[PDB]
Design a protein around this ligand. Structure first.
Ligand SMILES: [Ca+2]
Ligand SMILES: [Ca+2]
Length: 341
DNA sequence: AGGGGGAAGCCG
DNA sequence: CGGCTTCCCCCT
């Protein structure tokens, strides 16, 4: 199996630069403004000119502005980014049908029965890059390896505007030298738990008894990590099915008054419904509380949920959450549409 | 043994 | 911080 992973470089910011070539070479900070205060909210994506100063995704906007007070701060334009992305994805479909659209800016291609050699793979990666740059004016990073995980590692190593192959031998070396924290799917929580016990590299997870590993990080990731370190990850390209579409709004203040909350919830459902190209069979209401804790209550039907009962159902789920948590106020309210068609 | 449902984790 | 995905209870 030969897998080619495509990772659109600093996507949102880069789309902004394409829409405005006068931004290129300037710190660009694409943010999610929350509307509560001016400058409230978080950074969503920043270009390299910004991230070289610590201004990156996840940090509060006011921190960003503290570090880089003269950068170009732009609000999320997700509909645009998504149009561009759908075009690049369609573009990618010409090179393979076995394709997994992992997210808005990431996609996996099984080019196995379509190259037969890693040279062809590299060259095809250059072809893909040149095509994408030519048609959509954005640079991507291509990773190529023996599976999805190492393709992604390759991309991670070559960002931005890179191309990288990880042959079998380099896989062998990587199992031994690559930090657990750099393993795709492994975040800071898992990495910290493992780090506490001297588990630092992939091969390290072999040194510890399975039951103990599972006891630390859960069966799933334990099986995952181990299979990687044994170089037995054989997982195939699964075509899409990412059936979650969400929408979240921050309330004008914290409150338990459904009379205040429900309105914002409906608009959320509204904007959620037109973002999706199909019908959800399951709806979940999601409340972010005042202590930032999150409550979910959802319902699935054997049929599609029209927007008009999405309102009713979601109001029921909301009231239900307000019974479930009699203590805290709500700070943000949202919805997740699942099981789409 | 199995499929929800809801909380925990990842990562831009 | 925000929005998705993963995962692991939990109750037949
Ligand atoms: Ca990415
Ligand atoms: Ca990682």
């Amino acid at each position: 199996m030969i897998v080619l992973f495509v990772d659109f470089d600093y996507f949102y910011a880069q789309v902004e630069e394409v829409l405005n070539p006068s931004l290129k070479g300037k710190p660009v900070v694409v943010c999610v403004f929350s509307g509560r205060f001016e400058d409230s909210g978080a950074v969503a994506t920043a270009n390299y000119e910004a991230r070289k100063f610590g201004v990156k995704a996840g940090i509060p906007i006011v921190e960003a502005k503290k570090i880089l007070p003269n950068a170009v701060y732009l609000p999320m334009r997700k509909e645009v980014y998504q149009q561009v992305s759908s075009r690049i994805m369609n573009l990618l479909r010409e090179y393979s049908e076995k394709i997994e659209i992992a997210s808005i800016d990431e996609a996996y291609l099984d080019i196995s029965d379509k190259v037969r050699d890693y040279r062809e793979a590299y060259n095809l990666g250059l072809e893909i890059k040149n095509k994408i740059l030519e048609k959509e004016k954005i640079t991507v990073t291509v990773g190529i390896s023996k599976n999805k995980v190492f393709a992604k590692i390759a991309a991670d190593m070559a960002k931005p505007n890179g191309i990288k192959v990880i042959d079998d031998e380099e896989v062998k070396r990587l199992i031994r030298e690559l930090d657990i924290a750099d393993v795709p799917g492994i975040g800071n929580i898992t990495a910290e738990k493992l780090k506490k016990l001297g588990i630092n590299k992939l091969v390290d997870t072999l040194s510890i008894e399975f039951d103990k590993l599972k006891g630390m990080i859960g069966e799933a990731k334990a099986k995952y990590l181990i299979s990687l370190a044994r170089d037995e990850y054989n997982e195939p390209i699964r075509t899409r099915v990412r059936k979650s579409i969400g929408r979240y709004l921050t309330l004008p203040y914290n409150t338990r008054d459904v009379k205040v909350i429900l309105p914002y919830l409906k608009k959320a459902i509204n904007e959620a419904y037109n973002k999706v190209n199909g019908i959800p069979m399951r709806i979940t209401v999601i409340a972010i509380m005042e202590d930032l804790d999150i409550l979910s209550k959802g319902k699935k039907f054997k049929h599609g949920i029209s927007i008009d009962n999405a309102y009713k159902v979601a109001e029921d789920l909301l009231r239900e959450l307000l019974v479930r948590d009699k203590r805290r106020n709500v700070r943000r309210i949202g919805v997740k549409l699942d099981n789409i068609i």
